[PDB]
């Protein structure tokens, strides 16, 4: 139920404790790198970070954040299981979550899955 | 923020049934009747206010639970139990636990321990 997500740059997705934007910048999966996968119905998932708040696509208007008190939507994603065992996340605007290779804060405004939009993942506690 | 859904491990959501008859854990998706506002009911306990503005009642375990009480007394106060596996359970004032009954019958509050049907995944929704 709780997972981490490892980006194209081998770092781990970081909630940043809900302060500012999320980054794919952590060397190891610790507390801020763990997300509870929420079954939001109709095949959609949400992600609840270490702070008990929810990940938002921000509709691509700014880098993604983990600060929402409740799920609606911008907070539900398609979980895409790629052939190589990786995962991609499709936001409500139809765009994909991108690690941006750790070069900037995580975004959800790219319309296609390339390398920066594939995450390795595992259940952990 | 304080409005939540409860998903039983049959993967269905707890349903207020709009206050008509007993509550069931039978909804495929969390919509209006599946949202419950968590109300501080004092002394660390909580109440659950359903879509119809009325409160969830354990009925003291003597019949299936309902969501029709206009005000809080009790059979309407519960312990919110944070389980180690990230799920939650709800302890009625009779010491028993809310059970999904695997969706095979209406929801109950008369089992004395947390087992498989008494753990719920939860999230705050709008
Ligand atoms: O508590 C652990 C957290 O502490 C922070 O200082 C680190 O940047 C996070 O990566 C880590 O998850
Ligand atoms: O309802 C669509 C979206 O509206 C925005 O103003 C909120 O920031 C999002 O959290 C929400 O999902
Ligand atoms: O949309 C409001 C409600 O409609 C009913 O027909 C369904 O059984 C509920 O699950 C739902 O919440």
Short mmCIF file of C-alpha atoms and ligand atoms in Angstrom, two decimals:
data_model
loop_
_atom_site.label_atom_id
_atom_site.label_comp_id
_atom_site.label_asym_id
_atom_site.label_seq_id
_atom_site.Cartn_x
_atom_site.Cartn_y
_atom_site.Cartn_z
CA UNK A 1 0.00 0.00 0.00
CA UNK A 2 2.93 2.34 0.71
CA UNK A 3 5.48 2.64 -2.14
CA UNK A 4 8.45 4.64 -3.32
CA UNK A 5 9.05 5.83 -6.89
CA UNK A 6 12.52 5.94 -8.49
CA UNK A 7 13.03 8.31 -11.40
CA UNK A 8 15.09 8.15 -14.59
CA UNK A 9 18.01 9.80 -12.76
CA UNK A 10 18.06 6.94 -10.16
CA UNK A 11 16.80 9.31 -7.42
CA UNK A 12 13.51 8.97 -5.54
CA UNK A 13 10.36 11.09 -5.68
CA UNK A 14 10.30 13.43 -2.68
CA UNK A 15 7.14 14.99 -1.25
CA UNK A 16 9.37 17.74 0.15
CA UNK A 17 7.04 17.54 3.22
CA UNK A 18 4.46 19.63 1.36
CA UNK A 19 6.74 22.71 1.32
CA UNK A 20 7.00 23.97 -2.24
CA UNK A 21 7.16 21.59 -5.19
CA UNK A 22 8.00 17.88 -5.28
CA UNK A 23 11.41 16.86 -6.65
CA UNK A 24 12.96 13.61 -7.84
CA UNK A 25 16.11 14.36 -5.87
CA UNK A 26 16.53 11.93 -2.93
CA UNK A 27 19.34 9.37 -2.84
CA UNK A 28 17.37 6.83 -0.76
CA UNK A 29 13.67 6.21 -0.01
CA UNK A 30 13.00 7.50 3.50
CA UNK A 31 9.88 9.00 5.09
CA UNK A 32 9.29 11.77 2.52
CA UNK A 33 9.78 9.30 -0.36
CA UNK A 34 6.96 6.98 0.76
CA UNK A 35 3.45 7.38 -0.65
CA UNK A 36 0.28 5.51 0.26
CA UNK A 37 -1.49 4.38 -2.89
CA UNK A 38 -5.19 5.18 -2.58
CA UNK A 39 -7.85 3.37 -4.60
CA UNK A 40 -9.95 6.36 -5.69
CA UNK A 41 -12.43 4.33 -7.72
CA UNK A 42 -12.84 3.50 -11.42
CA UNK A 43 -9.19 2.47 -11.72
CA UNK A 44 -7.89 5.85 -10.52
CA UNK A 45 -5.37 6.17 -7.71
CA UNK A 46 -4.27 8.95 -5.40
CA UNK A 47 -1.03 9.32 -3.44
CA UNK A 48 -0.93 10.29 0.24
CA UNK A 49 2.46 11.60 1.31
CA UNK A 50 4.30 11.52 4.62
CA UNK A 51 2.41 14.63 5.78
CA UNK A 52 -0.98 12.96 5.32
CA UNK A 53 -1.69 15.24 2.34
CA UNK A 54 -2.31 14.31 -1.30
CA UNK A 55 -0.21 14.67 -4.44
CA UNK A 56 -1.65 17.06 -7.04
CA UNK A 57 -0.93 17.39 -10.76
CA UNK A 58 -1.55 21.14 -10.25
CA UNK A 59 -3.12 20.73 -13.73
CA UNK A 60 0.32 21.46 -15.16
CA UNK A 61 0.02 25.12 -14.07
CA UNK A 62 2.98 24.81 -11.68
CA UNK A 63 5.29 22.02 -10.57
CA UNK A 64 3.53 19.21 -8.71
CA UNK A 65 2.98 19.43 -4.95
CA UNK A 66 1.99 17.22 -2.01
CA UNK A 67 -0.11 19.57 0.10
CA UNK A 68 -3.82 18.96 -0.61
CA UNK A 69 -6.08 18.20 2.39
CA UNK A 70 -8.48 16.12 0.28
CA UNK A 71 -8.67 14.25 -3.02
CA UNK A 72 -10.43 15.66 -5.96
CA UNK A 73 -10.05 16.23 -9.57
CA UNK A 74 -6.34 17.04 -9.91
CA UNK A 75 -5.38 14.47 -7.27
CA UNK A 76 -6.35 11.27 -9.14
CA UNK A 77 -4.09 9.48 -11.61
CA UNK A 78 -4.10 6.60 -14.04
CA UNK A 79 -1.61 3.95 -12.94
CA UNK A 80 0.04 2.73 -16.18
CA UNK A 81 1.96 -0.54 -15.91
CA UNK A 82 4.70 -0.42 -18.53
CA UNK A 83 6.05 -3.55 -20.18
CA UNK A 84 9.40 -3.34 -18.36
CA UNK A 85 7.81 -3.38 -14.90
CA UNK A 86 8.01 0.41 -14.51
CA UNK A 87 5.04 2.66 -13.79
CA UNK A 88 3.80 5.92 -15.29
CA UNK A 89 1.14 8.24 -13.83
CA UNK A 90 -1.37 10.09 -16.02
CA UNK A 91 -2.94 13.18 -14.47
CA UNK A 92 -6.49 14.36 -14.96
CA UNK A 93 -5.36 16.73 -17.70
CA UNK A 94 -4.13 13.69 -19.66
CA UNK A 95 -0.47 14.63 -19.18
CA UNK A 96 2.16 12.41 -17.55
CA UNK A 97 4.13 12.87 -14.34
CA UNK A 98 7.77 13.62 -15.21
CA UNK A 99 10.85 13.32 -13.03
CA UNK A 100 12.31 15.99 -15.36
CA UNK A 101 15.56 14.02 -14.76
CA UNK A 102 15.96 15.86 -11.45
CA UNK A 103 16.82 19.05 -13.35
CA UNK A 104 13.70 20.91 -12.16
CA UNK A 105 10.73 20.17 -9.94
CA UNK A 106 8.41 17.34 -10.98
CA UNK A 107 5.82 18.33 -13.57
CA UNK A 108 2.62 16.95 -15.04
CA UNK A 109 2.45 18.69 -18.41
CA UNK A 110 4.13 16.31 -20.88
CA UNK A 111 1.70 14.52 -23.25
CA UNK A 112 3.77 11.35 -23.79
CA UNK A 113 5.69 8.74 -21.78
CA UNK A 114 9.44 8.92 -22.40
CA UNK A 115 12.30 7.95 -20.09
CA UNK A 116 11.71 10.74 -17.58
CA UNK A 117 8.08 9.62 -17.17
CA UNK A 118 8.81 6.00 -16.20
CA UNK A 119 9.31 5.16 -12.53
CA UNK A 120 10.62 2.06 -10.86
CA UNK A 121 8.58 1.30 -7.77
CA UNK A 122 8.32 -1.05 -4.82
CA UNK A 123 6.20 -1.57 -1.74
CA UNK A 124 8.05 -0.58 1.43
CA UNK A 125 7.35 0.39 5.04
CA UNK B 1 -10.18 17.54 4.76
CA UNK B 2 -12.42 15.99 7.41
CA UNK B 3 -14.80 14.37 4.88
CA UNK B 4 -13.71 10.80 4.14
CA UNK B 5 -14.61 7.51 2.51
CA UNK B 6 -14.10 4.01 3.94
CA UNK B 7 -13.17 1.10 1.65
CA UNK B 8 -13.50 -2.41 3.01
CA UNK B 9 -11.07 -5.09 1.95
CA UNK B 10 -13.82 -6.41 -0.37
CA UNK B 11 -12.72 -3.19 -2.17
CA UNK B 12 -16.24 -1.66 -1.96
CA UNK B 13 -17.04 1.62 -0.18
CA UNK B 14 -19.22 2.15 2.89
CA UNK B 15 -22.62 3.47 1.76
CA UNK B 16 -24.97 5.59 3.88
CA UNK B 17 -27.90 4.33 1.77
CA UNK B 18 -29.14 7.94 2.02
CA UNK B 19 -30.54 7.09 5.46
CA UNK B 20 -32.97 4.53 3.97
CA UNK B 21 -32.58 1.29 5.88
CA UNK B 22 -29.23 -0.07 6.98
CA UNK B 23 -25.78 0.89 5.70
CA UNK B 24 -23.90 -1.47 3.36
CA UNK B 25 -20.28 -1.77 2.22
CA UNK B 26 -21.34 -2.28 -1.37
CA UNK B 27 -20.54 0.80 -3.51
CA UNK B 28 -18.22 0.38 -6.49
CA UNK B 29 -17.02 4.00 -6.41
CA UNK B 30 -16.96 6.65 -3.66
CA UNK B 31 -19.69 9.17 -4.46
CA UNK B 32 -22.02 11.37 -2.37
CA UNK B 33 -23.49 8.63 -0.17
CA UNK B 34 -19.97 7.28 0.47
CA UNK B 35 -18.63 10.48 2.07
CA UNK B 36 -18.75 10.99 5.86
CA UNK B 37 -17.70 14.10 7.75
CA UNK B 38 -15.61 13.26 10.81
CA UNK B 39 -17.05 15.24 13.74
CA UNK B 40 -15.21 15.75 17.01
CA UNK B 41 -17.60 14.22 19.57
CA UNK B 42 -15.51 14.90 22.69
CA UNK B 43 -13.19 12.86 24.91
CA UNK B 44 -11.18 11.80 21.86
CA UNK B 45 -14.19 10.18 20.15
CA UNK B 46 -15.61 10.99 16.73
CA UNK B 47 -18.99 10.91 15.04
CA UNK B 48 -19.67 10.34 11.35
CA UNK B 49 -22.14 12.60 9.54
CA UNK B 50 -23.40 11.18 6.26
CA UNK B 51 -24.57 12.83 3.06
CA UNK B 52 -28.05 13.42 4.51
CA UNK B 53 -26.66 15.51 7.40
CA UNK B 54 -27.49 12.72 9.90
CA UNK B 55 -25.21 10.56 12.03
CA UNK B 56 -24.00 6.98 11.77
CA UNK B 57 -25.23 4.78 14.65
CA UNK B 58 -23.85 1.47 15.87
CA UNK B 59 -27.42 0.56 16.95
CA UNK B 60 -25.47 -1.03 19.85
CA UNK B 61 -24.82 -4.10 17.70
CA UNK B 62 -28.45 -5.21 18.01
CA UNK B 63 -29.27 -4.52 14.36
CA UNK B 64 -27.35 -3.40 11.29
CA UNK B 65 -25.88 0.08 11.44
CA UNK B 66 -27.78 3.10 10.12
CA UNK B 67 -27.18 6.74 9.22
CA UNK B 68 -30.35 8.52 10.35
CA UNK B 69 -29.76 10.08 13.80
CA UNK B 70 -30.37 13.86 13.78
CA UNK B 71 -27.90 14.42 16.63
CA UNK B 72 -25.03 12.70 18.41
CA UNK B 73 -25.69 10.47 21.33
CA UNK B 74 -24.55 7.38 22.80
CA UNK B 75 -24.38 4.84 19.97
CA UNK B 76 -23.08 7.54 17.60
CA UNK B 77 -19.59 8.00 19.10
CA UNK B 78 -16.65 5.92 17.88
CA UNK B 79 -12.93 5.45 18.47
CA UNK B 80 -10.90 6.10 15.34
CA UNK B 81 -8.28 3.32 15.41
CA UNK B 82 -5.13 3.78 13.30
CA UNK B 83 -3.97 0.28 12.39
CA UNK B 84 -0.32 -0.53 11.82
CA UNK B 85 -0.96 -1.51 8.16
CA UNK B 86 -2.20 2.02 7.37
CA UNK B 87 -5.89 1.04 7.53
CA UNK B 88 -8.37 2.21 10.15
CA UNK B 89 -10.99 0.58 12.34
CA UNK B 90 -13.95 2.06 14.20
CA UNK B 91 -14.84 1.03 17.76
CA UNK B 92 -18.43 1.63 18.83
CA UNK B 93 -19.44 2.59 22.36
CA UNK B 94 -20.22 -1.09 23.04
CA UNK B 95 -16.54 -1.97 22.63
CA UNK B 96 -17.22 -3.76 19.31
CA UNK B 97 -15.84 -2.98 15.86
CA UNK B 98 -17.58 -1.79 12.70
CA UNK B 99 -17.54 -4.64 10.17
CA UNK B 100 -18.00 -4.52 6.40
CA UNK B 101 -19.27 -8.13 6.68
CA UNK B 102 -17.47 -8.57 3.32
CA UNK B 103 -20.54 -6.94 1.75
CA UNK B 104 -22.54 -10.16 2.28
CA UNK B 105 -24.96 -8.43 4.67
CA UNK B 106 -25.54 -4.93 6.00
CA UNK B 107 -22.77 -3.35 8.08
CA UNK B 108 -22.61 -4.35 11.78
CA UNK B 109 -20.99 -3.20 15.01
CA UNK B 110 -20.98 -6.39 17.11
CA UNK B 111 -17.65 -8.21 16.59
CA UNK B 112 -15.22 -7.98 19.52
CA UNK B 113 -11.86 -7.95 17.69
CA UNK B 114 -10.40 -6.38 14.55
CA UNK B 115 -10.24 -9.06 11.87
CA UNK B 116 -10.19 -8.88 8.08
CA UNK B 117 -13.62 -7.33 7.65
CA UNK B 118 -13.06 -4.64 10.30
CA UNK B 119 -10.13 -2.86 8.60
CA UNK B 120 -10.81 -0.06 6.12
CA UNK B 121 -8.72 1.94 3.68
CA UNK B 122 -9.62 5.60 3.98
CA UNK B 123 -9.03 8.93 2.28
CA UNK B 124 -10.25 12.51 2.56
CA UNK B 125 -12.29 13.54 -0.48
CA UNK B 126 -14.35 16.49 -1.69
O1 LIG C 1 12.87 12.23 7.51
C1 LIG C 1 13.46 11.81 6.29
C2 LIG C 1 13.44 12.95 5.27
O2 LIG C 1 14.32 13.99 5.73
C3 LIG C 1 14.66 15.00 4.78
O3 LIG C 1 15.65 15.86 5.35
C4 LIG C 1 15.18 14.40 3.47
O4 LIG C 1 15.46 15.43 2.52
C5 LIG C 1 14.13 13.45 2.90
O5 LIG C 1 14.59 12.82 1.69
C6 LIG C 1 13.86 12.37 3.92
O6 LIG C 1 12.81 11.55 3.41
O1 LIG C 2 -11.48 20.60 -8.60
C1 LIG C 2 -10.34 20.68 -9.46
C2 LIG C 2 -9.14 21.23 -8.68
O2 LIG C 2 -9.42 22.57 -8.30
C3 LIG C 2 -8.25 23.25 -7.83
O3 LIG C 2 -8.55 24.62 -7.49
C4 LIG C 2 -7.68 22.53 -6.61
O4 LIG C 2 -6.43 23.13 -6.27
C5 LIG C 2 -7.47 21.04 -6.89
O5 LIG C 2 -7.04 20.39 -5.68
C6 LIG C 2 -8.77 20.44 -7.42
O6 LIG C 2 -8.62 19.03 -7.69
O1 LIG C 3 -24.42 9.48 -6.49
C1 LIG C 3 -25.15 9.38 -5.26
C2 LIG C 3 -25.42 7.91 -4.93
O2 LIG C 3 -26.22 7.30 -5.94
C3 LIG C 3 -26.69 6.01 -5.55
O3 LIG C 3 -27.53 5.47 -6.57
C4 LIG C 3 -25.51 5.07 -5.29
O4 LIG C 3 -26.01 3.80 -4.83
C5 LIG C 3 -24.53 5.68 -4.29
O5 LIG C 3 -23.38 4.82 -4.19
C6 LIG C 3 -24.14 7.09 -4.73
O6 LIG C 3 -23.28 7.74 -3.77
#
